[PDB]
């Protein structure tokens, strides 16, 4: 920070980041889980005219 | 539909519909809500019916998905499950219409000649629709399972 | 934090896909609800302190919590509880505007229960104060927007209890 | 531990008063939901293993964690992970039957975060596994009791975080 | 409650609750209206039962209010009637819970050591709870009187 | 039984029975007429249920009667039907007794070692008793099937 | 232990047969007498200490056993004796609720004769005490429940003798 | 989104959102239909934009697809077109969100280090994004082109 | 951090005496190895980015980790993975120059498992990435100096274990 | 226990003397046999479940003891019986490796007969079951070690009969 | 390892290493060259052992790879071959270590629970390890085949 900059939170502990972003909300689908690319099935695609 | 059957009979007779026939559309109208409930149940559970029936069909008849079979590849397996989706949609049409007339008129006349031209085992198609009946009766209530299985047994009888 | 649009974009990104029909339906639903969200946010930003003051009048005042031996006894502790309810109402307004509880999980509920357990803050009394905030906000804002605010305030209650 | 009955009894007892109707309606609501809780618990107790099976298949299998170097690589650690998910499902069934999340932070959550931090267990991966359990049991039981089950599953996740 | 007992036992055995406990839990859930009705009857008559039973105790056994007695003094008799109100509140807790665990965990563990310290006669406390039982059973209907007196004699049996 | 488990809990806590569990035994006694009615209709249909369930089992899993299965031969299929008859008898025993304790202490614990020494597939016999519970729920009334299906599903869970 | 329904279920299981009318008649008898047994057990648990004190007053007090040099003289010995008496009453209540005396001849009479012969406890005086308990219960709970109690109590007497 | 930016700013100020920011959110909510139209056009024409812009890129910079180039070969060219499709997808995300925040979060932070480690010329990636901007601006309406060109030129400026 | 020289000085200093002959032999062994250590450090410091490029191309590229849904998908996460591999290469060069793994114990393995578990970083995939770094470095520098680098790279891997 | 090699050591301990030739030749005979003993023990260790399965299949299967009314009818009794047979096979393996029956005399023949008389276990059924153990082991290994197995199994026969 | 077992057995009774443990460790050291040769030829032929044994397993047990089976499909077949390669690697670890405790600590604790959760037939996994034993024993001398088949039969005993 210079002579004009208010301090701000720059770094976190891993435990603090886990508290912030390991709850049920605000946790991404691809953090600790295999993401299967879901797709419309090929038989439904053939059944679509 | 039974209104279409009665109106065809009355028009070919060149008369008006008898009070017994007016009772036919009357009772059909009263049963319409339950028929719509059964068809909506099948429509909501559409993909699960087709997938489980396909897996159990391929378990009971492994040769059709073996190499050299009619449905070896993934695209041919998709065509199998697509035919199954066609027949499930026809079954829902028959459940809504209250009779087997749309099922017969759309996908049961010339089905033997079509699948003979395609080289497709018609008895295994019948087994597939039987597995569809089993999965639908599994995830449907018993009286509604009997109501759907009437049309399912009509399809099996036309295949066999 | 994420809003509803950011959640839809993140889901499509994790799938590695473009915006399909269902994603555009969710975007259209959020754009339909944005008018009510803006109006509710303006109403709450007007009546910020009023919701809190009859909420503590309904739920907290004239009880053993206010009386000596209670956790909200001193003027410092009273101002602390008023500030806490102001923060809860403001963050519920943030969540109602965004359409997601990601800001509630990131900046409110992280360690809040451990903080209140360390300080001795009554969880049940704090929850009942948030229910009072929910009832006053539902009476003051409307039906659907008040129900949305009640959903996010009950999310705060579930994360705290 | 406390169920809803003992919870409202101790809530009346800490203030020392008798049961009023604003407390009796809580017991009436619990007796309204009791048969739903019993039927959902019977379904989950009948299908306890397959919930964990499709949950691990949905979330943890073929990921980084089962590969060499991952946390559930060896069969001992895989069996420990299945045992942990069985613990979470059984205690969440207990919390759903009780109608109060006392047994969760009284017999699961009070030290499990420290234990997982000491073991190196991925807490976010366990949270995703519990979310997979929630989706499987919501599809298996129904929405009305699946929501109540998911409340205590998110309680377990929030205690783990 | 019985829910807490069954969950605690199944947890100690490290198993899910069997249907042989689940039917007990749902039976306790369904048979709750009678216990609720007895609970609001008792908390409606919460004062008068305490007044009449205290009057009956101090007329039956005047050694309690005798000089040199444990409750000699107006504030001592006030705390005695407060203890009667306490145990009536615990009886209402047990009635509305359908179990003896609230009375056991609140006001039965350490009562013998507590009144052994304070000098209050434990058999006279049992007589007080018995007199509250008789006043409540006279005040309410006979099957409900038996249901409340069940928890009442549990309390006086744990007393003596 | 549920009565003997109640008195086991009672002398484990080393006191008389609680009023809640006494009223619980009263509820069990009043419902025992309905459980005995379920016992009458199950022992009346003890043959047709096990025969239809065995036919459904062989229709679902033809690899049991195929070469490579455990039950190959007439005496092997007779012993398989005898096992299904014993397990149906155990479910009726549990419906009579009110708890899963007789099934546990006759034929449900150690079943892993039993069918491991026999080579019998535990998932296949679980599927067989699952077809037993489906045919039983088909033949029962709704409340009777709901009562018996909890004990059946406990058999499914502990024998899966 | 083994109550009436498990006893008839074991008798059926030894022959390997389903339950028929030859055991279901006794099963209907047990379910007809069940509420009588429960109400009698409630009365006995209500008056449990009073039955013991009137029994020792009418059979055991002012005797040579409570004279010095007797078998009930010291205070620990008297406490042990009344402990045995309400043990016999409570386990007889257990057998009366069960419908069979498996609990009585097993978890009371496993080595009771041998330990009383080693200690020197008078078996005849204990039989007189049990008969006094039987008379008090028969005069206190009724005729049919009294003789149902008396069957298990003189079963205890036959086990002691 | 701009809603996320306004909520983040108001949270940093620890206040409710200013009515100017409410009017910004109101304007974005009303104007989101045009943004959805732009994203729908880009999603529908995602393949022709990538193909034509890749051809124009490879004609303008032949060194990257000549032998010795970073994208020489059919699989490397497919990977380059996959990167262009990725950036067009991020452009659709930014158009939907109304700001450059998701574009910067997903595909601009560390892009210099990533392409420096890969050896890919970042100036040629910027040229590819510029050709995608030109083809998209030719393919949509002029106001839509001016709206999408802000996000496109943001990507140009952050790469350059 | 401690090298071999500071380890010898520490072991003599906590004894309070001067360097005896075994200390002289250990120092001469380190000074003999120092030529190879300096040459290997110079080669790695020159071709620092090429090793990371080859290891990422060998182990991480064209996989589900760098595909959408993986943790190396987003380009900030890709640049973070590149920075982490530069961290491992640079601190392994530091540990090779020191002849000891105290630098890895103090700045590299200090809570790295907790950091990666909180972020969601694949432990198995980053172990395979460090293995690819080890193979590329052993190919670049030689058998003996590559083995010397691989000792500390496997130390980083076993710290991640 | 004590082995065949320690048997002559214990005999010389009782006699207070060194090894004499009448024990030297027996020790050399044990040294000559020990490789086929330890290898046959390895073979039956590899195939240990098959001995129990075939013994149950050809001795106890379809009999009065396993039909209703038998002492091996129920699933618990079957599991206990196959566990007893597995323990018998394991201790017979121990003896045939060790060269002495002291392991059976101490760790099996302590009170097994009296426990079987207490439980009502059919002694003749166990004797024909260990005859089936003899036949399966002699078929699996061959008669050269089959008679050596049958020596300790006949020791089991004499102890249990 | 054998060294680990000897040190642990000495340390449990709190003494230095016995002459019997020194002789055992000496035998371990002298057999180290032969054990290293066995492990070397196993890890040299690790691909053909897995290939031939998987082929023999899938010929002898087609049910696990037929549709409806646990390993049906190319991905599940590759996963089964990956499991076979994992157990071959653990066999090489046990051959190097001179005993069975690395195989026990890595891949034989909780293997039944893991494969029960996976739905895989553990007897078919044991058949796969037995085919690996036969193929590997055909690739060595007789003493080396017996020595490796000792660890293989340990894996057979732990799986079945
Ligand atoms: C008089 C001021 C108090 C009092 C006494 C009282 N005691 C009894 C009866 C009995 N007391 C005992 C106790 C003992 N016997 C022993 O041998 C010993 C240890 C040496 C003790 C402690 C017994 C056994 C009896 C029963 C009579 C008998 O000995 O057989 C009574 C009679 C009560 C009755 O119902 O008969 C009385 C009146 N009671 C009081 O209120 C004063 C405190
Ligand atoms: C039928 C559902 C499946 C199956 C059957 C099968 N059973 C046997 C033989 C036996 N089964 C038992 C089990 C029990 N006996 C009991 O008394 C009880 C508790 C009530 C149980 C659980 C036993 C002991 C036998 C052996 C017969 C005997 O008593 O001597 C077999 C024959 C095994 C053989 O190898 O010969 C079979 C095949 N197998 C299937 O595939 C069906 C799914
Ligand atoms: C009282 C009816 C007569 C009496 C008896 C007497 N009892 C004891 C002490 C004991 N009582 C028991 C009995 C039981 N313990 C149990 O756990 C159960 C099952 C529920 C029973 C039935 C036992 C085992 C003892 C032994 C020591 C103990 O206190 O546990 C004594 C004391 C013996 C002594 O002094 O050591 C006596 C004298 N004597 C009479 O005269 C009454 C007629
Ligand atoms: C095409 C305009 C230019 C070009 C491209 C090129 N890229 C790669 C390799 C990769 N590029 C990425 C980048 C991204 N991943 C993301 O998720 C996003 C944002 C959504 C970006 C921008 C990645 C991850 C790779 C690695 C591929 C993989 O998935 O493993 C290559 C291949 C280089 C190689 O050595 O294989 C190429 C050729 N090259 C050009 O010359 C054009 C300028
Ligand atoms: C092949 C002989 C049989 C078989 C195999 C099969 N396995 C799986 C899936 C998994 N198996 C494991 C097991 C291990 N992981 C380890 O690290 C070790 C020890 C080193 C073992 C033993 C795991 C973790 C999986 C999951 C895959 C993953 O990596 O996450 C399958 C797939 C089942 C599924 O539902 O996906 C199969 C088919 N199947 C057979 O029929 C053969 C008998
Ligand atoms: C020891 C420090 C301490 C303070 C200061 C304190 C203040 C305090 N004043 C209150 C209310 C109040 N206080 C007043 C008093 C006043 N109104 C007037 O006009 C006068 C100017 C003024 C007093 C001179 C009134 C009227 C209320 C009730 C407001 C309401 O109920 O709407 C209340 C809420 C009622 C309750 O106790 O539950 C608190 C907590 N409590 C504390 O523990």
Curated annotation (Swiss-Prot), chain A:
Q: How does it assemble?
A: Heterodimer of ApcF (a variant beta-allophycocyanin). Phycobilisomes of this organism are composed of a two cylinder core, from which six rods radiate. The core is mainly composed of allophycocyanin alpha and beta chains and of minor components.
Name of the protein described by the UniProt record? Phycobiliprotein ApcE
- Subcellular location, record wording: Cellular thylakoid membrane
Give the protein's function.
Answer: This protein is postulated to act both as terminal energy acceptor (by its phycobilin-like domains) and as a linker polypeptide (by its repeats and arms) that stabilizes the phycobilisome core architecture. Has intrinsic bilin lyase activity.
The record describes its post-translational modification as:
Contains one covalently linked bilin chromophore. This protein autochromophorylates.
**What family does the database annotate?**
Belongs to the phycobilisome linker protein family.
Swiss-Prot record, chains B, E, F, H, K:
Q: Which CDD domains match?
A: APC_alpha
The UniProt entry's GO CC annotations, sorted and at most eight, read: phycobilisome; plasma membrane-derived thylakoid membrane
Which residues are noted in the entry as (2R,3E)-phycocyanobilin-binding? 80
Q: Which GO terms describe its biological process?
A: photosynthesis
Superkingdom in the source lineage: Bacteria
Which compartment or compartments is the protein found in? Cellular thylakoid membrane
Q: Which InterPro entries match?
A: Globin-like_sf, Phycobilisome_asu/bsu, Phycobilisome_asu/bsu_sf
Query: What is the protein's membrane topology class?
Result: Peripheral membrane protein
What modifications follow translation? Contains one covalently linked phycocyanobilin chromophore.
Gene3D superfamilies for this protein: Phycocyanins
Q: Which residues form a coiled coil?
A: none
UniProt keyword terms in alphabetical order: Antenna complex, Bile pigment, Chromophore, Electron transport, Membrane, Methylation, Photosynthesis, Phycobilisome, Thylakoid, Transport
May I ask which residue range the UniProt record assigns to the signal sequence? none
PTM sites of type N4-methylasparagine = 70
Q: What family is this?
A: Belongs to the phycobiliprotein family.
On subunit structure and binding partners, the annotation says: Heterodimer of an alpha and a beta chain.
Q: What does this protein do?
A: Light-harvesting photosynthetic bile pigment-protein from the phycobiliprotein complex. Allophycocyanin has a maximum absorption at approximately 650 nanometers.
Name listed for the protein in its UniProt record = Allophycocyanin alpha chain
Give the organism, scientific name.
Answer: Synechocystis sp. (strain ATCC 27184 / PCC 6803 / Kazusa)
Curated annotation (Swiss-Prot), chains C, D, G, I, J:
Q: Where in the cell is it found?
A: Cellular thylakoid membrane
Q: What modifications follow translation?
A: Contains one covalently linked phycocyanobilin chromophore.
Modified-residue entries (N4-methylasparagine), positions: 71
> Which keywords are on file for this protein?
Antenna complex, Bile pigment, Chromophore, Electron transport, Membrane, Methylation, Photosynthesis, Phycobilisome, Thylakoid, Transport
Q: Which residues form the signal peptide?
A: none
**Membrane topology classification:** Peripheral membrane protein
**Function noted in UniProt:** Light-harvesting photosynthetic bile pigment-protein from the phycobiliprotein complex. Allophycocyanin has a maximum absorption at approximately 650 nanometers.
| Protein name per Swiss-Prot or TrEMBL | Allophycocyanin beta chain
């Amino acid at each position: 920070f210079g002579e004009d900059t208010v301090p701000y939170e720059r770094y976190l502990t891993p435990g603090g980041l886990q508290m912030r972003s390991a709850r049920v909300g605000s946790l991404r689908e691809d953090i600790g889980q295999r993401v299967d690319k879901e797709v419309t099935p090929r038989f439904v695609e053939l059944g679509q005219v | 539909s039974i209104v279409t059957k009665s109106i065809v009979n009355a028009d070919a007779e060149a008369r008006y519909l008898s009070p017994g026939e007016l009772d036919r559309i009357k009772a059909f109208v009263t049963g319409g809500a339950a028929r719509l409930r059964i068809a909506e149940t099948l429509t909501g559970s559409r993909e699960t019916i087709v997938k489980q029936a396909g897996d159990r069909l391929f378990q009971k008849r492994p040769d059709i998905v073996s190499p050299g079979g009619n449905a070896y590849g993934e695209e041919m397996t998709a065509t199998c499950l697509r035919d199954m989706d066609y027949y499930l949609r026809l079954v829902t049409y028959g459940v809504v219409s209250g009779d087997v007339t749309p099922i017969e008129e759309i996908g049961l006349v010339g089905v033997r000649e079509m699948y003979r031209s395609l080289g497709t085992p018609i008895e295994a198609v019948a087994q597939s629709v039987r597995e569809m009946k089993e999965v639908a009766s599994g995830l449907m209530s018993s009286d509604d399972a009997a109501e759907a299985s009437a049309y399912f047994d009509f399809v099996i009888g036309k295949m066999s | 934090m994420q809003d509803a649009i950011t959640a839809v974009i993140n889901s499509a990104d994790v799938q590695g896909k473009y915006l399909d029909g269902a994603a555009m339906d969710k975007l259209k639903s959020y754009f339909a609800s944005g008018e009510l969200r803006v109006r509710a946010a303006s109403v709450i930003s007007a009546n910020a302190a009023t919701i809190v003051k009859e909420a503590v009048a309904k739920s907290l005042l004239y009880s053993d919590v206010t009386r000596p031996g209670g956790n909200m006894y001193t003027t410092r502790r009273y101002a602390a509880c008023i500030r806490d309810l102001d923060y809860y109402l403001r963050y519920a307004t943030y969540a109602m505007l965004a359409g997601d509880a990601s800001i509630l999980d990131e900046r409110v509920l992280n360690g809040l229960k451990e903080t209140y357990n360390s300080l001795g803050v009554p969880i049940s009394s704090t929850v009942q104060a948030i229910q009072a905030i929910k009832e006053v906000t539902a009476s003051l804002v409307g039906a659907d927007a008040g129900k949305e605010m009640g959903v996010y305030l009950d999310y705060i209650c579930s994360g705290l209890s």
